[PDB]
Amino acid sequence: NLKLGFLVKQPEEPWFQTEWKFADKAGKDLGFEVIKIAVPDGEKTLNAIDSLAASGAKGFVICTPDPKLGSAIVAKARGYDMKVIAVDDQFVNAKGKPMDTVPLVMLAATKIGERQGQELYKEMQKRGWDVKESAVMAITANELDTARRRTTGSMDALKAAGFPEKQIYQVPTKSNDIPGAFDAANSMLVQHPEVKHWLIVGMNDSTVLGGVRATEGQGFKAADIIGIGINGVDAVSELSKAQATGFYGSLLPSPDVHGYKSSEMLYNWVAKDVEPPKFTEVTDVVLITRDNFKEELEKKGLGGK
Ligand SMILES: O[C@@H]1[C@@H](O)[C@@H](O)CO[C@H]1O
């Protein structure tokens, strides 16, 4: 019957895999088919839209691989009389200004970053580290707004709790994955031999995990590393390991809400011209660690751990 696209930039992340599963549920409930397409670069993104048009889709939810493609995506969709909703990553114009007219569903980036820095600080205090020999490694992706509000939020929180600003070191990552973060973290680590304990800040689980893998290769044991990711679902294989690592826990948001609600809203828009809210910020978050990740995922219906 009705076909709707669900396009994501990183199909390998459990985060997006979960959005896809909940979109399928929305399709089962409301009576539409979801076409699941991977759009890891700009080219694929525009070609995928043409492909959706050929398939007869009336609209799509999309997590763009590049916010600056916003204009192009809007132009092509209009050309095909397709409605568009953005999930997680906001479209921006050439200048970098947000395209506020496109409905957006996303997590509360600032608030969850702040919660990341509060939980880092707390766990540091629990361990008794001497602040004088401690440092924060912030692995940033500042060209991505959502990534930038999380890492700024986290650094702001650490500063607000009393962590010395001069011991916060930032390093850019070229890709939002383990290899990009690994590389980034490694170059920062050799510049700071004086540090005995590291807090690793990054916008998501993969970034933090690459930071943690680099620390391991430079000789730090788990007690001297605290990394708290963001996404939850993406850290299950780490939390499931037999031995504890420097990856202490993850902040679990609601990818399930993002996949169903964006899909449901697209459908009401397509099927009834019910126009969606322009901005839907989901604030849900829970900290998962080795001790509770299974309880918490099951309690949220993201079962198996
Ligand atoms: O790439 C991140 C993704 O891993 C998830 O955290 C939602 O936001 C996107 O920007």
From Swiss-Prot:
MF (Gene Ontology): ABC-type monosaccharide transporter activity; carbohydrate binding; monosaccharide binding
Q: Where in the cell is it found?
A: Periplasm
Judging by the UniProt lineage, the source's domain of life is: Bacteria
Q: Please give the InterPro entries that the UniProt record associates with this protein.
A: AraF, Bact_Solute-Bind_Prot2, Peripla_BP/Lac1_sug-bd_dom, Peripla_BP_I
Q: Positions of the site: The binding site for the sugar molecule has not yet been established, but C-87 may be involved?
A: C63
Key words of the record: Periplasm, Signal, Sugar transport, Transport
What is an annotated GO biological process for this record, any one? L-arabinose transmembrane transport
Could you tell me what induces this protein? Induced by arabinose. Transcription is dependent on the transcription factor AraC, the cAMP receptor protein (CRP) and cAMP.
Q: Does the keyword Protease apply?
A: no
Cellular component annotations (GO), alphabetically ordered: ATP-binding cassette (ABC) transporter complex, substrate-binding subunit-containing; membrane; outer membrane-bounded periplasmic space
Name the principal localization, coarsely classed: periplasm
One matching Pfam family, short form? Peripla_BP_1
Q: Name the job this protein performs.
A: Involved in the high-affinity L-arabinose membrane transport system. Binds with high affinity to arabinose, but can also bind D-galactose (approximately 2-fold reduction) and D-fucose (approximately 40-fold reduction).
Which PANTHER family would you find in this protein's record? Answer: D-XYLOSE-BINDING PERIPLASMIC PROTEIN, L-ARABINOSE-BINDING PERIPLASMIC PROTEIN
Per the similarity annotation, which family is this?
A: Belongs to the bacterial solute-binding protein 2 family.
Q: What is this protein called?
A: L-arabinose-binding periplasmic protein
Source species of the chain: Escherichia coli (strain K12)
